[PDB]
From a paper:
CPV has two functionally essential components located along the icosahedral 5-fold axis: the RNA-dependent RNA polymerase (RdRp) inside and the RNA capping turret outside;25,27 a trimeric spike is attached to the latter. Each spike monomer has four domains: N-terminal, body, claw, and C-terminal.
The root of the trimeric spike plugs into the iris of the pentameric turret like a bottle cork. The final part of the monomer, the CTD, is a helix-turn-helix. In our structures of the CPV trimeric spike, we observed the PPPDE core in the body sub-domain 2, though its active site is buried inside the trimeric spike. Additionally, we extracted free spikes already detached from the virions, visible in the background of the SA-CPV micrographs. The reconstruction result shows that the majority of these particles are in closed spike conformation, indicating that the conformational change of the trimeric spike was not caused by spike detachment from the virion.
Author numbering: 26 to 1239
């Protein structure tokens, strides 16, 4: 059978196996089986090629969710928002008392009020992690109905459980049109979310389910053969959005109250970029909800496949290196120091100060300033002997007993404030603001209580008092001689069996000493840097508060420098006025009405009571006070008694002033006074008061100002801007934007003519080309000419790459192109302030200039021939917005703000709140976002850890920690990356076509040598919309186009659906497949990460991307890239105007360049019908020319090539 040498070989193979077993046992308990780990990895790859790319979902943790809620100030509603509670039992902190997730909403919703989840660990063997869990979910409905769900699970330490709660809000109906917006030539529709006379617009539902898994690692190790993981989804509740109701779920109103450390919690939302109407069909709604659920479940399953692979044997991962914060900080700090040195140099220039004439007339204006507290005074030591009073509401029914039989006791109340009531303050009252100047009134305020008599009005219907019990005391035993032993049991609000916790006190009033003394009124100019001169004018001031009033006139004004508390220092002129208003004679004249309450109601005081017994064996005095009351309110609540035949029950409350004034109401609004001099109500006086009228009467100071002034206002010196940049910039982006703003003034205003601008840009491009050492431009021109005439070259991609490298190396040319674009567009400075902390990228602008110039030099025509028409030019020329950066910027700004940017003298601060995008925050980009998204879905990227236990450690804890480490390290990679590119087209007065391009790629294989049906692949689509409609709040409403209008056939739709959802849509028509594809792309990327760049999109870069989307290359991504994010980063780089990757094959970039040039040439030939013909530019004649050219090029015939190039050039002459 075998020889002796073969037997020796067998023995050494056995010995090697034994050495492997020895090593494995040295390392610990975890398995090390390489073949089973490899089979697991291959099967996981096979599953992962099926995880859907769509829909687009954004994942946030708690911190990023809170920052996002703070960022968005308009309506914030998501079609699907899933709250996933995910945990691994080996990651839970077992020293915690409870494992809980609790979150709620502060508003009314059709289905949701609060969500509570508790995890109970019934058994947990930590040596071999065998856990038995019980999960209890509690949902409280808005009508206070409680719904309970249970889930039990027996499994392993390292397996994951996810509880997913989806809140669904579908916009099903828009009502209108209710008019026509005139700035944006669109009809106006409304979107009803709140209770009104209109039909509601939204329908709401919910979806609750649990995901569990079993990774049969123990069985696989015992039997030594692989077994696929098994994932179970349990459906707990599904409510479809069938009927339309008011109050959809707004995410700004959702609170996450408590999550036990160790539990993972994410928010997974899909929010539309613009508002759109959903389908009312039931099957369509259900597919919409289940696509969201299926993507979440697919990502869960991929993660669990990773966990099984990692448990079966050793898997090593290098974690991607994070960018160096500290090196970037040193570079930025050097740049900032250079700017400071430039400012020091510019400080050497001095010039004569030049002024300008300033005149202004202040019409009759009204302003109201509210003091910190209402003007009141609480007397000390206020005693009230009634049964009902400030503190007590004890009915006569209530049983109150004394030592004598049937002897009712008398109750009294004592109230005492704690602390000072005098206040000294100086304020800068706001008067009027303007982009030129701002007016402030400066005064000082005095208050103190004056010796007088208290005034106390008691309500016929008193509010729920703090001490309002059913009974106060009862008799337990009666003695013939000694007296009756009494037991007192007096609870305080709230009672143990109660709803809507409440309680309070009524406060006695007094009279105080008011002293308002106005010193002067000040005005400052924004751009003044030194004292103005020739200051003259007159101002009149009228004070009025309560019942008194004053008036004075100021004549002399002087140049002044003053500092406000929010805006900095101002330079201007002051108008001293010396008047005093003093209502010490009548400070207390609200006497008709005038009940004052203070609310003291707390969850922590429920069930508290005074419990004591008095009598023979018991002491004859009682003196007790609640200390929880002191903890919550820095005061006291007390009850004192003396045992005797006649007993008095003293209920004393003793509050501090600060707590009192932070908690009070001014009911008895029945007799509200009027502003003392018949002034119109100032929106802080009975303007939708809702019981706020007496506090405004007692707190608000209102004044009336009229006058005029004149002065000479200095101009800013010319050497100031660099000092300003050094003195107040925060980032390097601010330095760049400041340089742009200052350079806008250096450029000539002759550039505001189209011919001059085109000549300037041609001269810039000639400078750029003349400075090239290598001759890449001539070969590029040859490539472009061949492409136009039909001969497609393999190194068009090389030509494109050389052009992009030349552009990125010549940053001066890019800077000049950007500067002329910013100068020649409408409202350039407004735009530079709109940018904020971001910079516009000029690489794409110069890229477009180079492409257009290349084609035009090929056909031997100037650009001015294609730029003819009336203004605005992009509305009268169908190619101008595609070949010109200035017209593109104009069109994009008109689109982004619905022509609100064209209002006269509108500031960038006002315009910034008029964007037309849905759920748009000010931290978002003005132009459409264009970036790569790469984050996990349904779980965090790291685990929440623990601190090391302080005690002595034991082996099963070490084993549990190792299991947690292996379950968590390297398994939380995202399953895909993607990128979006969107371009906007103007077609008619109120019609736009928005073209969104999606490109995504799945996670790369561990084993990439397999065939392409089992490798990671890319999936992309181009989707179009039409903008015709707007809301009354200024936001666009979208209609989505069909697949035919996007260029797709039925077979194309089948291929796209397979790429984007990972399956053949079975039982779906092409209409349903396109509905799913189109609806899955309109979601918006929500993140707390901030971008610092703006990018302008172009139609021909979009064609370059469509070249990848429509005819993808035969590429093995798994073998070439380390990461699926790197591919989409390469594509995004190409989209941003940079060169193609050297990882790609040659023909990829070749085809991209051919597509962009062919698209531009078609556009130019279509436009040339105005100055050429269509009979001699027919498609049939051009096809013959192209076929002849290809044949002539393939056989080296220069005569025919030249003749055909002349024929093509002559197409554009006559």
């Amino acid at each position: 059978n075998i020889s002796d040498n073969d037997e020796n070989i067998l023995k050494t193979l056995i010995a090697d196996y034994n050495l492997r077993m020895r090593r494995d046992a040295l390392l610990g308990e975890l398995a090390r089986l390489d073949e089973l780990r490899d089979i697991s990895q291959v099967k996981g790859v096979e599953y992962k090629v099926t995880i859907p790319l769509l829909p687009v979902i954004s994942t946030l943790n708690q911190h990023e969710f809170e920052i996002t809620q703070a960022n968005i100030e308009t309506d914030f509603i998501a079609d699907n928002v899933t709250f996933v509670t995910s945990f691994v039992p080996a990651d839970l902190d077992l020293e915690q008392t409870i494992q809980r997730v609790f979150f709620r909403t502060t508003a009314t919703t059709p289905h949701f009020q609060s969500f509570n989840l508790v995890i109970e660990i019934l058994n947990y063997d930590q040596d071999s992690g065998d856990v038995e869990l019980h999960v209890k979910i509690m949902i409280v409905r808005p009508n206070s109905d409680v719904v309970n769900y249970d889930y039990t699970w027996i499994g392993k330490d390292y397996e994951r459980i996810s509880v997913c709660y989806n809140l669904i809000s579908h916009l099903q109906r828009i009502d209108g049109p209710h008019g026509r917006d005139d700035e944006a030539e669109m009809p106006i529709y409304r979107i009803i979310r709140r209770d009104s006379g209109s039909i509601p617009s939204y329908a709401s539902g919910e979806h609750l389910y649990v995901i569990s898994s079993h990774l049969h690692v123990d069985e696989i190790v015992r039997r030594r053969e692989h077994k696929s993981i098994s994932v179970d989804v349990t459906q707990l509740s599904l409510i479809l959005p069938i009927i339309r109701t008011f109050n959809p779920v707004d995410l700004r109103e959702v609170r996450i109250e408590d999550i036990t450390p160790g539990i993972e919690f994410t928010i997974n939302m899909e929010v539309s970029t613009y508002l759109a109407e959903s389908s009312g069909s039931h099957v369509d709604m259900q597919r919409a909800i289940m696509n969201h659920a299926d993507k979440i479940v697919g990502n869960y399953t991929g993660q669990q496949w990773n966990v099984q692979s990692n448990m079966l044997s050793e898997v090593r991962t290098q974690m991607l290196e994070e960018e160096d914060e500290e090196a970037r900080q040193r570079g930025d700090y050097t740049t900032s120091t250079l700017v400071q040195t430039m400012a020091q140099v510019s400080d050497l220039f001095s010039s004569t100060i030049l002024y300008r004439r300033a005149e202004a007339r202040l019409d009759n204006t009204v302003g109201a300033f509210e003091l910190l507290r209402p003007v009141l005074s609480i007397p000390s030591e206020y005693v009230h002997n009634g049964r009902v009073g400030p503190i007590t509401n004890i009915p006569a029914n209530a049983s109150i007993v004394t030592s004598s039989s049937s002897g009712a006791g008398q109750v009294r109340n004592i109230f005492k404030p704690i602390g000072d009531q005098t206040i000294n303050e100086s304020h800068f009252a706001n008067v009027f603001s303007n982009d030129e100047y701002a007016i402030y009134l400066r005064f000082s305020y005095r208050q103190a209580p004056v010796q007088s008599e208290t005034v106390y009005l008691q309500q016929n219907l008193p509010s729920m008092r703090i001490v309002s019990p059913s009974s106060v005391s009862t008799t337990v035993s009666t003695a013939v001689i000694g007296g009756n032993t009494i037991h007192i049991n007096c609870p305080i609000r709230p009672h143990r069996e109660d709803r809507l916790v409440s309680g309070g006190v009524q406060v006695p009033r007094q009279s105080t000493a008011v002293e308002i003394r106005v010193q002067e009124i000040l005005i400052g100019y924004r751009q003044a840097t030194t004292f103005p001169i020739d200051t003259e004018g007159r101002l009149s001031l009228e004070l009025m508060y309560g019942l008194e009033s004053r008036s004075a006139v100021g004549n002399t004004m002087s140049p002044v420098r003053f500092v406000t508390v929010n805006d900095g220092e101002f330079f201007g002129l002051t108008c001293p006025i010396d008047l005093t208003l003093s209502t010490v004679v009548d400070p207390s004249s609200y006497l008709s009405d005038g009940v004052i309450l203070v609310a003291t109601a707390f969850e922590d005081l429920r069930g508290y009571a005074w419990v004591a017994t008095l009598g023979g064996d018991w002491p004859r005095t009682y003196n007790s006070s609640m200390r929880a009351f002191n903890v919550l309110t820095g005061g006291d609540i007390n009850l004192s008694t003396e045992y005797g035949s006649e007993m008095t029950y003293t209920f004393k409350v003793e509050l501090p002033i600060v707590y009192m004034f932070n908690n009070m109401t001014v009911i008895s609004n029945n007799v509200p006074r009027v502003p003392v001099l018949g002034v119109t109500y100032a929106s802080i006086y009975q303007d939708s008061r809702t019981e706020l009228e007496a506090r405004r009467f007692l707190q608000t100071l209102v004044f009336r100002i009229h006058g005029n002034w004149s002065a000479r206002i200095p101009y800013t010196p010319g050497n100031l801007p660099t000092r300003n940049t050094a003195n107040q910039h925060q980032d390097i982006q601010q330095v760049i934007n400041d340089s742009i703003s200052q350079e806008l003034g250096r450029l000539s205003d002759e550039l505001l003519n189209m011919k001059n601008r085109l000549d300037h840009l041609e001269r810039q491009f000639e400078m750029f080309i003349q400075s090239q050492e290598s001759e890449w431009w001539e070969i590029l021109l040859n490539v472009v000419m061949d492409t136009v005439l039909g001969y497609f070259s393999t190194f068009a991609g090389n030509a494109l790459k050389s052009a992009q490298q030349a552009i990125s190396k010549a940053v001066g040319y890019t800077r000049r192109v950007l500067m002329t674009v910013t100068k020649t567009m409408r409202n350039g400075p407004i735009f530079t302030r709109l940018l904020g902390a971001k910079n516009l990228s000029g690489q794409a602008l110069a890229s477009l200039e180079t492409l257009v110039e290349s084609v035009l030099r090929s056909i031997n025509v100037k650009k001015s021939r294609f730029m003819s028409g009336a203004e605005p030019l992009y509305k009268n020329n169908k190619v101008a917005q595609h070949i010109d950066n200035t017209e593109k910027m104009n069109m994009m700004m008109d689109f982004s703000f619905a022509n609100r940017n064209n209002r006269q003298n509108i500031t960038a601060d006002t315009l910034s709140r008029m964007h037309t995008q849905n759920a748009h925050g000010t931290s978002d980009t003005v132009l459409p976002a264009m970036r790569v998204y790469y984050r996990p879905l349904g779980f965090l990227d790291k685990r929440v850890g623990e601190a090391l236990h302080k005690g002595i450690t034991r082996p099963e804890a070490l084993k549990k920690q190792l299991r947690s480490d292996v379950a968590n390290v390297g398994t939380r990679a995202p399953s895909h990356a993607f990128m979006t590119y969107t371009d906007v087209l103007y077609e008619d007065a109120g019609s736009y076509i928005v073209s969104k391009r999606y490109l995504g790629i799945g996670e790369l294989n561990r084993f990439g040598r397999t065939t392409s049906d089992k490798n990671a692949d890319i999936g992309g689509v181009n989707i179009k919309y039409r903008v015709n409609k707007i809301t009354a709040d200024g936001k666009y409403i979208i209609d989505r186009l069909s697949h035919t209008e996007s260029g797709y056939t039925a077979a194309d739709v089948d291929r796209l659906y397979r790429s984007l959802f990972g399956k053949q849509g079975d039982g779906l028509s092409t209409e349903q497949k396109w509905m799913d594809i189109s609806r899955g792309v309109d979601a918006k990327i929500i993140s707390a990460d901030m971008v610092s760049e703006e990018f302008l999109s172009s139609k021909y870069t979009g064609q370059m991307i469509d070249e990848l989307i429509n005819s993808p290359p035969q590429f093995n991504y798994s073998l070439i890239y380390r990461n699926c994010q790197d591919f989409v980063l390469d594509v995004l780089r190409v989209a941003q105007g940079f060169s193609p990757s050297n990882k790609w094959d040659v023909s990829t970039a070749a085809r991209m360049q051919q597509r962009r040039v062919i698209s531009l040439m078609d556009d130019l030939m279509s436009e040339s019908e105005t100055f050429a013909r269509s009979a001699h530019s027919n498609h049939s004649l051009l096809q013959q020319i192209r076929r002849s050219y290809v044949k002539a090029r393939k056989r080296g015939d220069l005569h025919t090539v030249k003749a055909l190039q002349l024929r093509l050039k002559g197409f554009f002459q006559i």
